[PDB]
Amino acid sequence: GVYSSANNCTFEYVSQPFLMKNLREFVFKNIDGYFKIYSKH
Amino acid sequence: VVVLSFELLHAPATVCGPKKSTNLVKNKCVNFNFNGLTGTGVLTKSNKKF
Structure with a gap:
């Protein structure tokens, strides 16, 4: 496991898996506070 | 309170x-105003595939 300690949690999001042989291309961009994730499998 | x-x-x-x-x-x-997009026009069914 990872993160035995964490505090001051401000955000949580859950969605179907990003990953679900496949190339798993991702682009991670961060503009004006928004974290934009693009992908192709 | x-x-x-x-x-x-x-x-x-x-x-x-x-x-x-x-x-x-x-x-x-x-x-109209569609999720922040505003304008004037006639809305009809489209055959476009978004």
Whole structure:
């Protein structure tokens, strides 16, 4: 496991898996506070 | 007693509020606002595949 300690949690999001042989291309961009994730499998 | 404190930061956030909608009318000249996009025109069924 990872993160035995964490505090001051401000955000949580859950969605179907990003990953679900496949190339798993991702682009991670961060503009004006928004974290934009693009992908192709 | 509940105190609602509104702390406006420069950080991005969802705009919170009960945004209301009207019924959709087709084949007439209307003004419109679709999720922030505004204009005037006639809305018809499209064959475009988004």
